[PDB]
Write a protein that binds this DNA or RNA. Structure first.
Ligand SMILES: [Mg+2]
Length: 228
DNA sequence: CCTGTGACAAATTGCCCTCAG
DNA sequence: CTGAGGGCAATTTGTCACAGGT
DNA sequence: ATTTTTA
């Protein structure tokens, strides 16, 4: 049995997406990525791109009060305006219409229809993971890294991944100061590895690769907790 | 050029409180 | 009661000066 | 439900 179907996980929603989206350049908050997980699930459960979110189900899934769930949704929704996702040279807006609330506790969004082929009809070159794996992660760049690791994950839960550092900076859109490699180490790399090791079922180590005086790549290795 | 760390600026966390319906 | 508002201190993330080649 | 990518 593959760990995607392990008994403790199987009941959580299966999030699935093309590797082009896993590799795309975009910048979303934790809260925005949490809602996008719910949109992809909904879309795949049956599409014109019009989706829904209930405050009450959001609070239940992420372990929040009703009031904070309402705050998270309202502010993340407004901040979606003007956000674009760039595939690799090809930019699309996430939303083609502002969000609105038809009735108390309910919100309605229109996801760009040109993005729907990135979430359905996948036969290969896709990324998969259970929502329960990511819902305790806090830092949004730790969410980006976890999805990239998942992209090379074998059915048994393990894998290895080399990632060029210039590429990480471009596609995750890290802030300016993380071009200085000691800041990249202390505020992105160590922080995100610690989050994955303590909030997911993945167990992760890494080694730096150098060319001359420059560090150019990180090489990641990992195994699943249910195999240990 | 490269490294780590102290410090300070700005953003984000989970909580708290009020009230309409 | 929920959930749509208003707020908080604690805590993390983003930036840079400095010391020094470990 | 599933698979093709790093190097
Ligand atoms: Mg919040």
């Amino acid at each position: 049995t593959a760990v995607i179907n392990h008994k403790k996980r199987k009941n959580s929603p299966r999030i699935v997406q093309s590797n082009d989206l896993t590799e795309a350049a975009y910048s979303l908050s934790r809260d925005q990525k949490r809602m996008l997980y719910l949109f992809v699930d909904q879309i795949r459960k049956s599409h014109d791109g019009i989706c829904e979110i209930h405050v009450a189900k959001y609070a239940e899934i992420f372990g929040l009060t009703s009031a904070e769930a309402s705050k998270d949704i309202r502010q993340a929704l407004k901040s979606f305006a003007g956000k674009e996702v760039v595939f690799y040279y090809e930019s699309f807006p996430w939303f083609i219409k502002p969000a609105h609330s038809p009735s108390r506790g309910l919100y309605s969004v229109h996801i760009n229809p040109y993005l729907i082929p990135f979430f359905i009809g996948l036969q290969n070159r896709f990324t998969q993971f259970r929502l329960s794996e990511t819902k305790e992660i806090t830092n949004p760049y730790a969410m980006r890294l976890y999805e990239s690791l998942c992209q090379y994950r074998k059915p048994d839960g393990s894998g290895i991944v080399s990632l060029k550092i210039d590429w990480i900076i471009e596609r995750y859109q890290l802030p300016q100061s993380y071009q200085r490699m000691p800041d990249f180490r202390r505020r992105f790399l160590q922080v995100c590895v610690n989050e994955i090791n303590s909030r997911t079922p993945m167990r992760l180590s890494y080694i730096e690769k150098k060319k001359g005086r420059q560090t150019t790549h990180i090489v990641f290795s990992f195994r699943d907790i249910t195999s240990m």
